[PDB]
Amino acid sequence: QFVKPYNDDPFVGNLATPVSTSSFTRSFLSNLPAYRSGLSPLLRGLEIGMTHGYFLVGPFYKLGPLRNSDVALISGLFSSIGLIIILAACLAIYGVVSFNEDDNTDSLQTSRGWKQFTSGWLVGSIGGASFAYILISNIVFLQTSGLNLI
Amino acid sequence: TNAIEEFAESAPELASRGLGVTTNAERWNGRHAMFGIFAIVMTAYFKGHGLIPDAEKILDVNQWGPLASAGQGQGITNERAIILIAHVHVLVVSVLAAFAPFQFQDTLVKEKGYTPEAPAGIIPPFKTGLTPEAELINGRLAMLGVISIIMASIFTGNSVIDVVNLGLGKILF
Amino acid sequence: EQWVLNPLKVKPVAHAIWDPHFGQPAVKAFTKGGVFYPVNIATSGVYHWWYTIGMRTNNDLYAGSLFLLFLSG
Amino acid sequence: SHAVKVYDTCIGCTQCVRACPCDVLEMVSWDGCKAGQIASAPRTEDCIGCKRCETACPTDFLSVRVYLGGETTRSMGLAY
Amino acid sequence: FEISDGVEFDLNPLVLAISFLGWSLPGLLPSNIPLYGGKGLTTALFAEIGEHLQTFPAPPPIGDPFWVILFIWHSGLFATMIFGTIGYNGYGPKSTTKY
Amino acid sequence: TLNLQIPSPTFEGSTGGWLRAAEVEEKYAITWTSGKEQVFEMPTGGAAIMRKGENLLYLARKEQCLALGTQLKTGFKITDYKIYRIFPSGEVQYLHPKDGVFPEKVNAGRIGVGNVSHSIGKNLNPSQIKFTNKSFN
Amino acid sequence: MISDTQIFVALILALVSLVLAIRLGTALYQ
Amino acid sequence: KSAAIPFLEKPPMLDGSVPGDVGFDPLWVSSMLPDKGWYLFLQEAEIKHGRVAMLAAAGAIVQDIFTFPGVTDTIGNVKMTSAHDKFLSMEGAGGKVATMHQLLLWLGLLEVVSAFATIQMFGGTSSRMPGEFGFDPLGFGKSEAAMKTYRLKEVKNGRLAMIGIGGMVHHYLLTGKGPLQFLGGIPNYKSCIEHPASGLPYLMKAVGPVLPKIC
Amino acid sequence: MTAAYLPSILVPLIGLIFPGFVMGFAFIYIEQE
Numbered sequence: 001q002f003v004k005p006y007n008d009d010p011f012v013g014n015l016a017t018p019v020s021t022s023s024f025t026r027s028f029l030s031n032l033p034a035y036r037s038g039l040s041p042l043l044r045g046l047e048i049g050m051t052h053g054y055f056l057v058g059p060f061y062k063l064g065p066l067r068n069s070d071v072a073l074i075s076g077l078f079s080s081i082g083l084i085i086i087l088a089a090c091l092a093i094y095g096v097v098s099f100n101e102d103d104n105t106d107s108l109q110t111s112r113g114w115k116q117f118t119s120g121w122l123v124g125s126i127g128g129a130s131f132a133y134i135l136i137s138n139i140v141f142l143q144t145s146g147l148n149l150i
Numbered sequence: 151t152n153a154i155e156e157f158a159e160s161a162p163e164l165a166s167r168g169l170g171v172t173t174n175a176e177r178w179n180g181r182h183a184m185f186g187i188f189a190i191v192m193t194a195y196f197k198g199h200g201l202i203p204d205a206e207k208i209l210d211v212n213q214w215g216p217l218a219s220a221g222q223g224q225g226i227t228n229e230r231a232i233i234l235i236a237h238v239h240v241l242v243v244s245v246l247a248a249f250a251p252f253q254f255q256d257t258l259v260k261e262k263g264y265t266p267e268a269p270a271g272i273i274p275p276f277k278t279g280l281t282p283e284a285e286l287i288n289g290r291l292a293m294l295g296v297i298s299i300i301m302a303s304i305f306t307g308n309s310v311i312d313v314v315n316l317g318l319g320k321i322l323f
Numbered sequence: 324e325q326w327v328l329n330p331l332k333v334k335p336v337a338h339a340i341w342d343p344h345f346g347q348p349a350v351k352a353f354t355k356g357g358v359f360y361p362v363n364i365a366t367s368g369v370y371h372w373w374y375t376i377g378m379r380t381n382n383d384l385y386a387g388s389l390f391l392l393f394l395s396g
Numbered sequence: 397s398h399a400v401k402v403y404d405t406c407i408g409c410t411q412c413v414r415a416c417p418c419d420v421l422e423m424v425s426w427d428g429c430k431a432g433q434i435a436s437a438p439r440t441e442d443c444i445g446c447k448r449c450e451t452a453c454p455t456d457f458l459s460v461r462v463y464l465g466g467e468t469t470r471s472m473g474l475a476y
Numbered sequence: 477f478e479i480s481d482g483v484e485f486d487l488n489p490l491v492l493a494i495s496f497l498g499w500s501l502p503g504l505l506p507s508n509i510p511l512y513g514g515k516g517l518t519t520a521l522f523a524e525i526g527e528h529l530q531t532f533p534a535p536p537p538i539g540d541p542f543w544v545i546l547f548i549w550h551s552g553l554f555a556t557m558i559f560g561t562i563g564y565n566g567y568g569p570k571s572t573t574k575y
Numbered sequence: 576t577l578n579l580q581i582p583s584p585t586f587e588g589s590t591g592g593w594l595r596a597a598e599v600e601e602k603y604a605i606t607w608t609s610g611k612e613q614v615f616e617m618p619t620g621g622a623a624i625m626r627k628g629e630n631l632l633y634l635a636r637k638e639q640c641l642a643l644g645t646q647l648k649t650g651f652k653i654t655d656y657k658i659y660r661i662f663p664s665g666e667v668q669y670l671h672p673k674d675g676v677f678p679e680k681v682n683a684g685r686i687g688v689g690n691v692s693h694s695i696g697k698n699l700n701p702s703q704i705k706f707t708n709k710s711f712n
Numbered sequence: 713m714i715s716d717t718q719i720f721v722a723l724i725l726a727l728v729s730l731v732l733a734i735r736l737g738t739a740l741y742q
Numbered sequence: 743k744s745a746a747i748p749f750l751e752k753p754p755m756l757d758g759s760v761p762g763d764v765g766f767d768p769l770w771v772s773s774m775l776p777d778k779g780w781y782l783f784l785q786e787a788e789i790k791h792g793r794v795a796m797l798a799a800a801g802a803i804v805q806d807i808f809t810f811p812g813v814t815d816t817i818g819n820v821k822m823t824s825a826h827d828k829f830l831s832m833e834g835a836g837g838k839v840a841t842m843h844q845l846l847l848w849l850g851l852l853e854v855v856s857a858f859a860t861i862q863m864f865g866g867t868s869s870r871m872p873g874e875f876g877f878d879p880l881g882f883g884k885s886e887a888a889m890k891t892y893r894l895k896e897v898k899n900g901r902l903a904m905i906g907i908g909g910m911v912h913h914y915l916l917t918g919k920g921p922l923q924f925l926g927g928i929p930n931y932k933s934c935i936e937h938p939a940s941g942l943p944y945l946m947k948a949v950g951p952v953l954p955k956i957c
Numbered sequence: 958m959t960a961a962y963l964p965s966i967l968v969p970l971i972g973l974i975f976p977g978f979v980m981g982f983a984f985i986y987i988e989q990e
């Protein structure tokens with residue numbers, strides 16, 4: 001009843017399941033930036049990088065080598081920036097290798113589309129890391145994970 | 151022209167994207183060398199006037215990690231660290247410009263079908279102004295000046311900052 | 324140069340260590356050569372080899388390295 | 397693709413053809429064996445290299461030999 | 477709401493309410509054991525929630541009856557929720573399959 | 576020729592079916608007539624019900640198609656199974672029962688490919704075919 | 713005891729050898 | 743083309759229909775995102791910054807003029823950003839006042855609703871124009887021509903206030919003086935008044951070591 | 958600028974930059990038509 005063939009195609013290597021083809025799943029996936037409609041590859045990259053560079057600062061800030069120092073947050077931001085640069089390089093090389101120069105009109109599966117996506121991802125990631133750095137440096141609750149209220 | 155075409159044949163990957171020995175690479179390196187001569191003059195001024203705080207203080211290894219320790223049991227000075235971070239700022243600007251260039255700006259990596267700029271040759275036309283001829287002339291001059299400054303510093307034994315000061319006539323400090 | 328004086332007492336150091344992962348305990352533990360920086364102690368015998376050959380100063384070793392670079396070229 | 401070859405030793409037993417999971421071997425006419433048939437390998441581009449043909453061969457040294465050569469999607473049996 | 481590609485699901489919250497009450501009303505059954513105090517499971521959970529809200533930032537210490545009461549109450553609640561959704565969707569008023 | 580309107584054996588779905596490589600490179604098909612509604616085993620995994628009449632099935636590999644054909648021929652007694660290969664351009668080609676008769680029995684018209692005129696012992700040595708274009712045959 | 717000028721001469725010879733190694737690598741790759 | 747800068751190409755996005763559009767965008771910021779709603783988002787950002795800046799400038803000046811009854815008794819004689827800092831110093835968990843937190847709460851409700859509005863405008867679903875909140879009780883801009891003239895006036899005064907409030911804040915940080923005082927004293931660095939710390943202390947790091955500290 | 962700075966200047970280069978650039982260029986070369 002709940003599990004069925006994918007797209008009514010019994011011989012495709014997939015099954016239609018609640019996790020895979022439910023209404024909530026479809027809405028969530030179709031509203032994520034990687035799939036939302038109307039966004040340019042640049043805007044997709046911007047949103048995704050913003051979201052990712054934010055979470056990156058914390059692990060580095062609170063568990064890095066200079067975590068028990070007075071420069072822990074700056075060190076964390078710096079290490080996030082380095083990782084963001086490495087991942088932007090990965091994105092760029094993947095784009096140049098995978099996508100040939102034929103023009104499919106910026107569909108995120110084109111050379112131009114992926115270039116825009118990686119540029120937006122770099123900008124948004126650096127911006128999000130900086131925003132997280134500002135918020136952590138200025139709010140005590142984030143520097144102590146709530147152990148200021150104790 | 152012959153060297154440019156031969157390089158285009160030898161290394162199609164770099165030349166097609168504008169990297170390697172190309173007019174675009176010449177222009178970019180001239181830009182960076184001019185900015186670098188300016189940076190050397192500015193650091194000469196700051197060091198001479200003592201504007202760099204705690205210049206001779208050795209960074210603490212306990213605070214700044216093992217990275218604050220230099221090669222031979224030495225410590226990096228606050229002045230070196232400050233200048234390095236000043237360079238880090240422009241390096242991040244560089245990465246952002248390369249990956250996400252301004253719409254109007256020149257791009258570091260050129261497209262596959264881009265048309266290479268005409269090789270100027272011995273000297274571009276002396277088009278005085280904020281022109282692409284003046285830019286190339288001054289970039290070539292700045293690169294040659296960087297090489298000459300380093301060579302003078304090594305030969306005469308003076309520092310690079312000392313040589314820049316001597317050449318400018320000790321106006322900086 | 325300080326090994327050619329008391330070769331039976333001084334440990335020969337191969338090269339300096341620069342690892343940004345070392346703690347202060349490790350830097351101290353690897354400063355055994357009386358050189359004031361962490362080092363590796365050579366196990367190849369190049370010290371004894373060169374001393375027997377006739378190398379006495381660091382300039383001799385440097386000139387040898389220059390010549391071998393020229394020969395590689 | 398793998399290079400599959402047949403030799404004069406064929407006796408026309410056809411077991412090589414029947415053992416092939418793909419359709420690479422087929423029986424053709426011949427006069428060198430009592431059965432009057434010899435194995436042939438027209439669709440060698442579909443060969444995967446399992447050597448089931450080699451296993452199902454009754455002649456002292458095999459009449460059918462598979463020499464594994466360049467690999468392709470079909471040779472590697474990649475459904476993806 | 478589609479639970480799958482084309483399968484619809486009611487997702488009635490009254491099922492949740494009924495299952496919650498079905499597990500919680502029996503939970504009122506008091507016990508004089510130290511864990512419950514004198515009270516039942518649901519009442520003990522409410523009391524612990526209030527007591528540890530009074531001391532908000534500090535968590536209930538390991539060994540506090542709060543953790544055991546929480547675990548038991550939620551185990552029973554989730555069991556009753558599963559059974560209630562099964563009853564409402566398979567044995568309910570509009571089910572098709574004879575279960 | 577292949578008719579793309581033949582129904583399919585009412586399979587319930589699986590994760591062993593074809594993938595993007597089928598849409599990009601090659602997708603094989605098998606068609607066969609069944610006298611009744613039996614239960615057979617998919618080459619990808621699971622059970623399926625074949626229909627009374629013609630049945631068309633899509634797979635990713637010729638070996639899967641031929642394994643299904645062998646199952647039909649041995650387990651059941653269906654031997655009218657035809658195998659095709661489809662490219663993204665719509666270039667459906669015909670492969671099994673290539674000449675209309677199975678390869679296990681000789682048929683007039685075939686040409687011997689890859690046949691050699693000696694025993695394996697008569698092969699040349701790599702030293703003899705080195706720096707030359709000769710073949711070890 | 714080894715001066716920076718000496719280390720720099722060594723680096724220059726190393727760079728010349730690197731250039732020649734790139735040349736040989738090209739000629740071998742052909 | 744750019745009228746503003748007669749020697750530079752107008753950016754493609756600057757058609758000139760937008761009020762206050764004199765072709766000034768040397769960095770082609772309007773063209774940074776290919777999405778249609780990017781320029782509208784930029785216009786709304788300009789309007790919002792101009793409005794906040796206009797209110798901030800008026801507040802600095804009026805705070806110099808007079809202060810509400812009792813605020814002196816509560817926060818002392820602190821002025822400008824130091825007043826914000828003082829209120830926040832008293833707004834702790836064991837604190838009595840919640841001035842800045844109340845302001846943030848209400849303005850944040852307004853701002854989340856405005857965030858939804860600007861999202862809808864950016865996506866093109868809504869016909870709202872940048873900076874249009876439907877606030878026009880006196881109906882000054884009901885006429886479209888009047889609306890256009892008033893939009894240009896609002897953007898111009900908003901830009902001027904954006905510059906002016908930054909000037910005021912930096913003058914206060916340097917000299918411990920509000921706008922009207924700083925205007926009065928010209929050799930201000932002679933009559934500089936004490937000022938509490940900014941609350942962002944690191945930003946004045948280079949003022950003394952690298953920069954001159956005429957005081 | 959002394960030779961004692963050369964380890965701190967070079968080890969990060971030789972160990973993070975040279976490998977990164979080599980890996981990127983080799984990736985582009987190996988996956989290229």
Ligand code: CLA
Binds near residue numbers: 074079081082344968
């Ligand atoms: C041999 C070369 C090499 C070098 C020079 C370093 C250097 C470093 N490693 Mg180590 N590392 C190496 C190999 C190396 N690693 C390998 C092979 C591994 C795999 C096992 C690791 C795994 C590893 C881990 C898991 C960690 C380190 C960390 C560190 C840092 C030392 C501790 C500290 O306080 O810094 C930290 C203080 C900082 C301020 C970090 C700033 C780093 C900047 C941003 C680097 C610039 C990156 C650059 C822009 C990227 C260019 C990409 C291009 C090549 C394509 C330092 C950056 C620690 C760290 O914090 O790293 C971030 C750490 O947690 N390394």
Ligand code: CLA
Binds near residue numbers: 135849854
């Ligand atoms: C314009 C100049 C200005 C500057 C430079 C500062 C600077 C500062 N303020 Mg702020 N502040 C300003 C204006 C300014 N303020 C104004 C006009 C107000 C009145 C509204 C306030 C009210 C205010 C308060 C109440 C507090 C500060 C604090 C601070 C400090 C930390 C800020 C920070 O890290 O933010 C980083 C965080 C943000 C920029 C905002 C985060 C937004 C999140 C991510 C979104 C959450 C959405 C949420 C669902 C909203 C629902 C609605 C809700 C309101 C009900 C810092 C000194 C804090 C402090 O401790 O100062 C000593 C503090 O508690 N400020």
Ligand code: CLA
Binds near residue numbers: 221339719723
């Ligand atoms: C092949 C011999 C060899 C080896 C194994 C090493 C090893 C080392 N050197 Mg190097 N070095 C060499 C020759 C060699 N060196 C020579 C000839 C010179 C004089 C120009 C130097 C000058 C030098 C300096 C100044 C420093 C090092 C440092 C180091 C250490 C880190 C790597 C580095 O920064 O390299 C950097 C090396 C260079 C910039 C130039 C030399 C590069 C050589 C010639 C490459 C030869 C490649 C080889 C022949 C073939 C590669 C095989 C392939 C399969 C990969 C490490 C212990 C650093 C350190 O931290 O030491 C503790 C350091 O500060 N070396």
Ligand SMILES: CC1=C(C#C/C(C)=C/C=C/C(C)=C/C=C/C=C(C)/C=C/C=C(\C)C#CC2=C(C)C[C@@H](O)CC2(C)C)C(C)(C)C[C@H](O)C1
Binds near residue numbers: 187
């Ligand atoms: C300074 C600085 C910085 C910097 C920088 C940068 C980017 C510096 C870049 C410097 C560069 C690229 C220098 C290149 C020099 C080339 C020379 C001298 C070629 C000479 C050729 C000759 C003589 C010839 C010739 C020939 C002759 C005779 C005739 C011909 O027919 C044949 C032939 C070709 C053989 C940065 C940005 C890092 C910041 C830092 O704070 C400071």
Ligand SMILES: CC1=C(C#C/C(C)=C/C=C/C(C)=C/C=C/C=C(C)/C=C/C=C(\C)C#CC2=C(C)C[C@@H](O)CC2(C)C)C(C)(C)C[C@H](O)C1
Binds near residue numbers: 799881902903
């Ligand atoms: C929208 C709307 C309405 C409304 C409304 C409202 C409430 C409108 C409010 C408008 C306001 C408050 C506008 C304020 C503009 C302030 C400026 C331009 C300040 C410039 C300062 C400068 C240049 C400066 C400076 C300075 C510096 C740098 C340093 C100082 O030492 C010196 C100095 C002072 C010279 C109404 C009610 C009509 C109803 C309508 O239906 C809807």
Ligand SMILES: CC1=C(C#C/C(C)=C/C=C/C(C)=C/C=C/C=C(C)/C=C/C=C(C)/C=C/C2=C(C)CCCC2(C)C)C(C)(C)C[C@H](O)C1
Binds near residue numbers: 188189292295299
């Ligand atoms: C201001 C500014 C900036 C800028 C900038 C710019 C545009 C900076 C430009 C800098 C330039 C063009 C520097 C040139 C230096 C040339 C030298 C030292 C030549 C030596 C020649 C020799 C020794 C020749 C010798 C020769 C002679 C005499 C005769 C023949 C033989 C030989 C002996 C070899 C930025 C970008 C940083 C931004 C900033 O916000 C604003």
Ligand SMILES: CC1=C(C#C/C(C)=C/C=C/C(C)=C/C=C/C=C(C)/C=C/C=C(C)/C=C/C2=C(C)CCCC2(C)C)C(C)(C)C[C@H](O)C1
Binds near residue numbers: 823
């Ligand atoms: C409350 C608070 C604080 C705060 C605060 C606040 C409210 C700080 C506000 C700061 C502001 C508004 C700064 C503005 C700077 C504007 C500049 C530099 C404009 C340059 C314009 C130029 C160059 C124009 C050029 C112009 C252009 C473009 C084109 C041609 C014409 C020309 C004239 C050339 C703190 C920080 C103290 C912290 C504290 O804990 C809490």
Ligand SMILES: CC1=CCCC(C)(C)[C@H]1/C=C/C(C)=C/C=C/C(C)=C/C=C/C=C(C)/C=C/C=C(C)/C=C/C1=C(C)CCCC1(C)C
Binds near residue numbers: 052125126128
């Ligand atoms: C799945 C599930 C189960 C249980 C409940 C739970 C909530 C945990 C849930 C999981 C939730 C998760 C995983 C939440 C994670 C949230 C994350 C990673 C949010 C990230 C938010 C990022 C933000 C704001 C970034 C802000 C960035 C800004 C302004 C950047 C601005 C800038 C940019 C972009 C470029 C130029 C510079 C400038 C202007 C600074």
Ligand SMILES: CC1=CCCC(C)(C)[C@H]1/C=C/C(C)=C/C=C/C(C)=C/C=C/C=C(C)/C=C/C=C(C)/C=C/C1=C(C)CCCC1(C)C
Binds near residue numbers: 720723730
């Ligand atoms: C020091 C100094 C003084 C003043 C002026 C100056 C600007 C020059 C300044 C700066 C100098 C600088 C930056 C020098 C840089 C030194 C460098 C890059 C040294 C590196 C040398 C590397 C070497 C040998 C590598 C040798 C590798 C070899 C054989 C590899 C062999 C091969 C392999 C592995 C594959 C097949 C091909 C081949 C060639 C057989």
